[PDB]
Design a protein around this ligand. Structure first.
Ligand code: MNH
Ligand code: NA
Ligand code: ZN
Length: 187
């Protein structure tokens, strides 16, 4: 897991809970004097342990916390890789490009990143079928990111998530409904 993901998490924990709390999380779930360098790889278990700790402090379901992180993470990625997100003029284009443009670039920007496998298909009625697959099983982080992407383009979405790696499938299907954006009027 790249340091940048940890850095965005810090911004989140520091904003909601305070810097004193982040240093608790970090002292407890990471080796002495850890510094997350944005471009370096670190053990994904350090992230899961920090996030699991937060979920428990807040008495929240772990996937609700991961989803909320994903939503904060989109903005934090977009502002650190503005050149990548400015390639897209609307939500639907960005979703259709997560795999072949965005995470494709992430392979040129970062040494050997650990990325999911994603394929989007455009459906009738302004829906997208986004198939997700990853051994890390972070489909709820992906829901958050989609909600973040929506906020970014002043779009409104809903997501159905009824095939899931957590309920035994080898992938997830995120059926995205685009309810509104600046180019949707009556329908
Ligand atoms: C909305 C769109 C969107 C979705 C659904 C999305 C999905 C994911 C998910 C889920 C993961 C966690 C790992 C896994 O195996 O599941 C992940 C990781 C990652 N993604 Mn993104 N991603 C973006 C946008 C998205 N990404 C943008 C914008 C950037 C920045 C250019 C970016 C760059 C990354 C980086 C960097 C990683 C981390 C890889 C690693 O830690 O090694 N990407
Ligand atoms: Na509109
Ligand atoms: Zn899932």
């Amino acid at each position: 897991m790249k340091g940048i993901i940890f850095n965005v998490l810090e911004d989140m924990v520091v904003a909601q809970c305070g810097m004193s709390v982040w240093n608790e999380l970090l002292e407890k779930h990471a080796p002495k004097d850890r510094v997350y360098v944005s471009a370096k790889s670190y053990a994904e278990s350090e992230l899961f342990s920090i996030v699991q700790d937060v979920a428990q402090r807040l008495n929240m379901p772990i996937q609700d916390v991961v989803k909320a992180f994903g939503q904060f993470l989109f903005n934090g990625l977009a502002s650190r890789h503005t050149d990548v997100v400015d390639k897209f003029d609307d939500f639907t284009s960005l979703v259709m490009g997560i795999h072949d443009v965005i995470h494709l670039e992430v392979n040129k920007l970062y040494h050997e990143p650990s990325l999911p496998h994603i394929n989007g298909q455009l459906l009738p009625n302004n829906q997208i079928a986004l198939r997700y697959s990853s051994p890390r099983r972070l489909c709820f982080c992906a829901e958050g990111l989609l909600f973040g992407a929506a906020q970014h383009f002043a779009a409104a979405i809903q997501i159905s998530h009824d095939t899931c790696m957590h309920t035994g499938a080898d992938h997830c299907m995120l059926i995205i409904e685009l309810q509104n954006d600046e180019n949707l009027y009556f329908q």
